[PDB]
Every structure is written in C-alpha cells, then in structure tokens.
Nucleic acid binder design. Sequence first.
RNA 1: ACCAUAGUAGGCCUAAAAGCAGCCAUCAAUUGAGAAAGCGUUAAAGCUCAACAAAUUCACCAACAUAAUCCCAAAAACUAAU
RNA 2: CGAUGUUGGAUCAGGACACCCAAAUGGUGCAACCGCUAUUAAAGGUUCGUUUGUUCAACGAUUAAAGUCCUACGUGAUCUGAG
Lengths: 38, 222, 49, 59, 118, 49, 16, 29, 162, 43, 97
Amino acid sequence: FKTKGVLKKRCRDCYLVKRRGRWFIYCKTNPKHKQRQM
Amino acid sequence: FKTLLPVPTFEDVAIPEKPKLRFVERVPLVPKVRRERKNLSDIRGPSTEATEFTEGRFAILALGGGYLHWGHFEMMRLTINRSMDPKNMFALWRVPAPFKPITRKGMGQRMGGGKGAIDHYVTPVKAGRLIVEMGGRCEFKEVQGFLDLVAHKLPFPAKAVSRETLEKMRKDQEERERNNQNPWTFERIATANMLGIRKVLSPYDLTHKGRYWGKFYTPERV
Amino acid sequence: AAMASVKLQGLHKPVYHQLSDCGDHVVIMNTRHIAFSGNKWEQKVYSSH
Amino acid sequence: KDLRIDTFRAKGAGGQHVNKTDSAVRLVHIPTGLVVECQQERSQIKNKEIAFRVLRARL
Amino acid sequence: KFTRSRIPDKVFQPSPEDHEKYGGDPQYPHKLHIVTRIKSTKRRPYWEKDIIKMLGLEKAHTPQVHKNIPSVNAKLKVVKHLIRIKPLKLPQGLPTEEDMANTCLKSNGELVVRWLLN
Amino acid sequence: DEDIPEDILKNLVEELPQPRKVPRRLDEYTQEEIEAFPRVWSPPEDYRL
Amino acid sequence: VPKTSLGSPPWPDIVL
Amino acid sequence: GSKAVTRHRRVMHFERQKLMAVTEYIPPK
Amino acid sequence: FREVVEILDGKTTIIEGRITETPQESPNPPNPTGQCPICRWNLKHKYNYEDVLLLSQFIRPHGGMLPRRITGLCQEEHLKIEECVKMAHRAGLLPNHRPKLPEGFVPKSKPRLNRYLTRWSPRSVKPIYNKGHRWNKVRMPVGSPLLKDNVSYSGRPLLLYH
Amino acid sequence: RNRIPGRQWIGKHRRPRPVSAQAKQNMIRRLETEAENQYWLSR
Amino acid sequence: AAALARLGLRAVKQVRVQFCPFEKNVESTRTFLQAVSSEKVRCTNLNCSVIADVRHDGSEPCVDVLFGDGHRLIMRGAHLTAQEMLTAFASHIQARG
RNA sequence: ACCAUAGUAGGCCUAAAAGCAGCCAUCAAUUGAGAAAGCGUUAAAGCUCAACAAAUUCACCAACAUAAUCCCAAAAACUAAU
RNA sequence: CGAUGUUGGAUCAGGACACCCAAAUGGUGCAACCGCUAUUAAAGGUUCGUUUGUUCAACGAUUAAAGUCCUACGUGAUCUGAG
Ligand SMILES: [K+]
Ligand SMILES: [K+]
Ligand SMILES: [K+]
Ligand SMILES: [K+]
Ligand SMILES: [K+]
Ligand SMILES: [Mg+2]
Ligand SMILES: [Mg+2]
Ligand SMILES: [Mg+2]
Ligand SMILES: [Mg+2]
Ligand SMILES: [Mg+2]
Ligand SMILES: [Mg+2]
Ligand SMILES: [Mg+2]
Ligand SMILES: [Mg+2]
Ligand SMILES: [Mg+2]
Ligand SMILES: [Mg+2]
Ligand SMILES: [Mg+2]
Ligand SMILES: [Mg+2]
Ligand SMILES: [Mg+2]
Ligand SMILES: [Mg+2]
Ligand SMILES: [Mg+2]
Ligand SMILES: [Mg+2]
Ligand SMILES: [Mg+2]
Ligand SMILES: [Zn+2]
C-alpha cells in the first residue's frame, strides 16, 4: 500500500472502495496502484 | 441512437506571433536604491486593476491576496509553454514584473540598526485580479485541465475561469445578495453604526462590506 | 442516572436542604441490558490510573 | 543531500555560555568523506558560515 | 484611529411599511419623546458619555421626556444605540393645573391624567 | 438482572417510569396494526426480491 | 391513514 | 499586536465574531 | 413477485420462473398529485428509524434495499430511507430480515449490546483515547445529518453530535 | 495535555471559544430595538 | 457475451434455442441467443452447433444445453431475465469441468 | 453494456517511421468508425477509447500524521422556549 | 540577582513513537538468499574497550539491536570536580 492524502486512479482498472471508514484504491492488474487515505 | 449536437467553430480567432509566455527578468533593469515601507494595503481589499478580459477567453482568477516573486513566474511560464499548443493557444501576462523590494536583515542579530539590505522583488496581487490570460481556438475543458495545476501552486487560492464562468459567479453573487432572507446584513449594521459596532470594526470595513478580512477573501459572505 | 441522582440527593422533597440528611434509596435492576445511544459502545472510554 | 551537519559542542572558556551551547559545526561531505570542523566564533551561525566556505575551498 | 461615526441621511428615510409596523402616523409626526437609557456609558468613548449626561439620562431605566426638534434629535442619533425611544401618547390630553398630582406614566408610553380616582 | 434479595423487595414503595419509550420490533406488531398501516407503493409483478 | 411516530404530537391532546 | 494583514487568519474580536454570525446568508426556503 | 426454481432430476437441470401475487398500493392517498411515494402520502419529514412499518416496504427479504428505479423514490428521500434502514438493523429491529444460516446460529457469542441511533458501523469506529478539553472536544456522533429536517414539535434543534 | 500558549485570551494564538445560540438572540434583540430607535428620530 | 468467452465454452457440446418471436415474453430469450452466438463465444470449439429454432404458436421460449460430462440443462426462459439465464449457464460450466 | 471492418506502409521523413519521433495534409468505402484519443512494438502485430446498433435511476466537485507524570465535569438526538 | 549552583560521567531511571531489535503485513526494477520502501504495535531489551575533561567523532572486538528525543538539555540537602 501507499498512505496518501488524495486518491487518484493511475489506471482504468483501479476501483474505489470504502472499508474500515477509509477509502482504498484497490487494483488487480497492477498491485503497485494500491493506495490508502490517511 | 443519440443526438448529433453542433460543435463550436473557432474561425475568427487570430493567433499573434510568439504565442508563448514572455520571459520576465528576476530584477528590474534600474534597481531601486531607496528602501520604502512595506505597504500592506496593496494586498488588502478588492482589486481595481485588471479585473476584466482584454483579448483572451480564459484566465486564472485570484480569489485571495498574496505576493508573486520570480519563482512563481518561472513556474507559471514553464508549465504553460510545455503543456499548450503554440499553433492554437496564445497567452498574455496580466501582472507586471517584480518591482517591490523585500528586505531581509542578516541572520542572527539584535533588533535595531535600521532596515537591512534588499533581498528580492515581489509583485503584489489583490483579490479578483486575473494573473495569466489565455485565448485561442480551443474549448475551455482542455484549457482548464492544465490551468488548475498552475492555479493550485500559487500562494493565494485561485481558480481557472473563462468568460462565461466568470459572469455566472458574478451573476450569482448578486442573486444571492438580492434574495437574502436575513433582515440584518454587514452593510446595514456597519454603515449605520448600530450597537456601536464601529469601535470594533476598521474604517476599511465600510467598503469591504465584511467580505474581506486581512488578505483573505471569503466569497460566501453576503 | 438523571432521575436516580435527584432521588439520592432528595431534590424531590419540598423539605430539601443540604445540611439535612434527607435521602432516598434507589434500586436499579436489569443493568446488563442498558442501551447506549449511537456508537458510544466503542467510542466512549473509561480511564483510571 | 551531500552534506551531513553534526551540531556538536566546542571546547574553550566561556563560563555558562560554553557549557550550554552547541557552538560547533562538523561538515561531512557524503560523496567524498571529507570532514570539515569550524568552532572559531561564539555563535553557531558564524561557525556554520565559515565551515561552508572552507569546505568549498578544500574541494 | 478610532473617531466619531457619521450617520448617512439615507438611514433615516422610513419605508412605507415602517409606519404600519411601528404604529407611527404617516402624516403627522408625534410631538414628544420618551427616552430611557438601557446600556452603560462605560467602555464607550468620552463624547458619548457627555451626551448621555447632558440629556438627563444619568440613571438607567428612568423615563425622560424630550422635544422632537432637530436640535435634540441631533444628539440622540449619536447615542441611539444606548437608549430606548418611544412616543408619548395622551389619551386624555395635556394635564391641567388641577390634575398635576394625579398623573402616572404607564409602561406602554401613555400618560394617564387621572390615576386611581377615589 | 432481576435477582433481588427478598429483604430488598419488601422495602420498595413505588416504581419510577422508564425515561425512554422502548420501540417495538417488527415481529411485535399485531396483524391488525400491519393491515392498518397503508401500503405506500405498488411494486411491479415481474421483479424478483 | 398514515401512523408515523412523528405524525402526531408527542404531548397528550387536551379538550377543555 | 500583529499587523493588519497577516498569514494566519487573524482571530477576530469576540464582538466581531457575533457580528459575523448574525449577518449570515439564509437561502430562501 | 417472481421467484426462481432450480430442480435437479437425474442429470437434468430445469430452471423456471413463477409469478406470485403481489400486494398493491392502497386505493386513496391523501395527496394524489404527488410524485414519489413518500410525499404522496404526506410522509415527508415525518418518519424516523422507529417507523418499522414504513421501512419494511423498501427492503428485500434478506435485509437488502430495493433500487431507487423500482420504488420510484426521489434521490433526497431514498438516501434518508437508506440511512434509516441501516440504523434500524443495528438498533435490533427487523429480526426476520436476516439471512438463514443453520450452521452459524449454534455457536453463540458474547450477548448483543443494545444500541440505537448508530450512525457508523460497530466494526469501523476507534476508541477516543484522547478526548480533549472544551475548546477542542471530540464529540461522538448520534443519528445522521440526513434526518435533521424532520419536524420538531418541541422546537429545539436535534443534537446530532454529543 | 493540550495547552493554550501564553495567556488564553491575548496574542496571536487565542482560545477557540465559539459564539452560542444565546448570543445570537441577544444581538438580534438589541438590533430590533435600535431599528425602532432610528425610525422615531426620522421625522 | 464477454463473460462466456473468458470461462471456456469448449466443454459445451450443443446449444439450441426455441422461441416464438411474435410473443411478448421472448425478449429475454432473444438476448440470451445473441450473447451465446457472439463471435467471441463461437471461437472456442469448432464442433459446437448452435440451433435457433423459430416457431409462432409454440408459446414456450426455451433453451436446451448439453455439457461434455453428459448433463442436460434445459431452462424455459419466459419470466427469467437475460442476466439470470446467462449466470446459470456460466455457473454450470465451472462445476461440470 | 456492446463493439470494431476500406482505399492505405497517405505524402514526407528515417537504418526501419504500417493511426501512434518529426514535417505536411487531414480526404475517403460502408447505415456505421478520428490518415487518430491512450497503451504497446526496434519497426509491425496486439489491447483500449470515439462512431454502429442495443439501451436509458443518478453521477461538477467536495479525502491531509505525531510528544513526552494520568484521558479529563458526569451525561443527554423531542411533553410544547422571544 | 536580602542567590533558580553551572559541562561531562557514577547510581536510579519516569515518559513519548517520528521504532534500532523482537511480532504481524502491503509494494517492488521481490525467483531464492541478501535488500530497498510503506502500514500496525512501546510489555521487554538496546555491549565491552584505546585516545580526548569531554557530549560528539575516529578506530578494535562483538551483538537479535548497540534507536531518536523530552524530563530545570532528569538526577551535586546522593557522589565525582578532570573541564
Ligand atoms: K494554494
Ligand atoms: K496567547
Ligand atoms: K510516424
Ligand atoms: K539570580
Ligand atoms: K523503552
Ligand atoms: Mg584560556
Ligand atoms: Mg495593536
Ligand atoms: Mg499560560
Ligand atoms: Mg477569542
Ligand atoms: Mg465505443
Ligand atoms: Mg507516520
Ligand atoms: Mg474526569
Ligand atoms: Mg528568599
Ligand atoms: Mg546519565
Ligand atoms: Mg525507561
Ligand atoms: Mg507508528
Ligand atoms: Mg522487526
Ligand atoms: Mg542537569
Ligand atoms: Mg551534575
Ligand atoms: Mg554534598
Ligand atoms: Mg538536588
Ligand atoms: Mg580543576
Ligand atoms: Zn491500477
């Protein structure tokens, strides 16, 4: 993951999802796109 | 099946020679050998110079006040030049070159002695003054994309605006002021000196109407 | 606790006075089934040293 | 990125001032490994100013 | 610098709905004021203190009657945020020399000539 | 819970009312109440719940 | 007739 | 005391805060 | 209402849909000219999480909520109904709208803690270890801001944050 | 744990004491009285 | 259609579609036919024959499939939606393979 | 969601420039599809987006870490408040 | 300023987490091994020596690791006085 402030989609396959009270950028093709709002 | 909407046509727009932004010098050609007082009224209050479009159709609107020095001019010039099409876009400066000197006394010395030496130069900018004006034969959607990046990096908060958008936010700052359902407004209380409020308010608050506090401009206050 | 505090102090008797020993016993049953409003079951904390 | 500054103390004679002041600078040039230390004046600003000048001259 | 406040004359232009709201008379202005001080002269400039002193409003919550001439109104506008102003109403008219001692001033702003007869 | 010694029970006088009205669940509503409350909308016949 | 919780005032009705 | 123009959203006098809260904008309902 | 039946009969699978009779809307609404069902029956700004008889008509048999397209509710009311259903489930109401899992009911757990007006979910809130003084106080939310437009007979505004 | 630097009512950093609903009503009641004050002085 | 291509239709022997185009509850069957007869689904087994039976008064829109294992999946789609029919078809492929 | 076929490696350019260094033009088959919006290739190939049809809840924007002896009144969303 | 005794060590350590080790995990230009980077966690632990009054730094040997910082840069009505 990468704790970041603002979430942006680096590729078209990234999908937003709200878990545990925070928004997470989860990506399937590229795991390096995983981001986590602080 | 959908509707084939018409496309805007831009054929009356003429691109001037050297459409890219002009280079701005770090220091004015003739330096100011006399150090003057740091006026702060040049930031406070609404702007009176360069509040309307002249040639272009898009511009960066300055919502707040602040100082621009040579560093910000480089950021604005380099970003726009490498991100636009010189054939279809032309840009124009709406602020002068840095001319107001800023003084910085030496590191670690007791107060006193006098004003220090001139360090750099800045350009005062008020609220509502256009910074960079761009025009061309292209729509606003693509121009807005690379102008918000420039506006975000400015000291004062700013937005990328066009001719239609600027009029809409000015025609809505009057409708929101005409239909206000609150009997008491800052303009009525301050001017009439109700509750003896003039002891707390500043003499400039008569003109600012409560929308300006220091260098900060809140557009939602009526 | 709001109504229980009043009964313990005696603030319901028109003969109330702090110096006097007026006070009423209160018996509270089914205290395992209290219902905290909102998310106070996980947010409110009780601390001691 | 190429300079590591160790604000250690100095040795001299200043009474309470020396015992309670980190008036010394140890400049270390990370790419090369040179160590330049300046603890001449009383203020760290003066020591830091000279240390930078000496490091450039020696390089 | 903090100085005196100049009140523009546009403030004192009543709307047509003002008369119906406050019970004023559209044609004939009232004749006498009833002035009652509400706030304190402390934490206020010195020029407001003198105007309060020279209007007989030293003691708060005590009604005082003044004329409606512009000379008095000029001073009231300075301290209009420290006083309460109501018109003086005369249901029985001006008292005569016989009924001077039986006068009483009600809270609503009317002067009753004969108070608690017999 | 409701496990009070007989000594305490014999001392009681009156019971204070509950400060919060406990809402009733769906299964606690009688069939007369269910039929009384109007049906707000008419779902389509072809939808699968 | 709707019978919502807030449909009717909580206080008891009075008939003088 | 600070200058008239600062960088930190100068805190208003408490009397002025009440003025800024009683002169708000209420959209029509 | 339509239901799907899947049958296995000797290496042959048959899938068919059957239509079940559906209850209809009540004949006479007080406000026939309304658009969405909520304001058609004068229920606007008059329901809360307690009104189970209303929230039990816009939910699925297994606790889910029907889409806005089928019901016809306006977006403003649909979110408010969605919030109330979430609060109703956490409050302990609607006990027959949970899915059936015979294997999971036997292993009981810690007894349920009674709650109501829970804005968030029980597993997504962290303890407030450092509360703070009165000038910077972390207030525990109760209820939802979507229900601040409800009618107040007392006249005092509802205290959402306490 | 959290302190207000210096004195809590003077200086650059102060106490965040907000305006209350009671304070708003007090301002309005005074404003209504003064609105009537400047009408009786008009004519 | 895209779902079927990723799931390996090579294990399906024969698919037939019997529907009456003049009826009202055959829209779902039409969508199922077009999804399974797409170009992507076709290019997975060049032995599979898709049959589009057309009648008028049959009044029974139905789909019949035979898997490689030898099971007979027949679903009479008249009230089912296109998504329900395709999803059931997709589910049986993984189990029977 | 679904869906991709013509002149044609357009001219020039380059060791090779096939919609996809650059220059130049930006016409044209098909009811429908840009001498190309993105990715990719040494160059090709290939994937995706605009246009076919199908079909129709809504969708501009609003995310921001921590300090040192022990957290800090207790608590409360509606019985009527200028 | 009718006195708040001032560097370093010795003894005893209290606390923070912006974690050096120990435990769990995401990413990689992560095959494995050795690494780089990010999230979570402070109950316990964080060596002995040559030169310098030294804190700091250099060097020898080792360790799972030899953390950063606050505490009147903790601690002289407990000691030391080399500076
Ligand atoms: K900014
Ligand atoms: K302060
Ligand atoms: K090319
Ligand atoms: K002293
Ligand atoms: K420790
Ligand atoms: Mg000496
Ligand atoms: Mg001052
Ligand atoms: Mg203090
Ligand atoms: Mg304050
Ligand atoms: Mg397309
Ligand atoms: Mg961190
Ligand atoms: Mg306490
Ligand atoms: Mg003494
Ligand atoms: Mg020690
Ligand atoms: Mg310790
Ligand atoms: Mg941490
Ligand atoms: Mg570890
Ligand atoms: Mg010490
Ligand atoms: Mg010592
Ligand atoms: Mg001693
Ligand atoms: Mg001591
Ligand atoms: Mg000595
Ligand atoms: Zn991605």
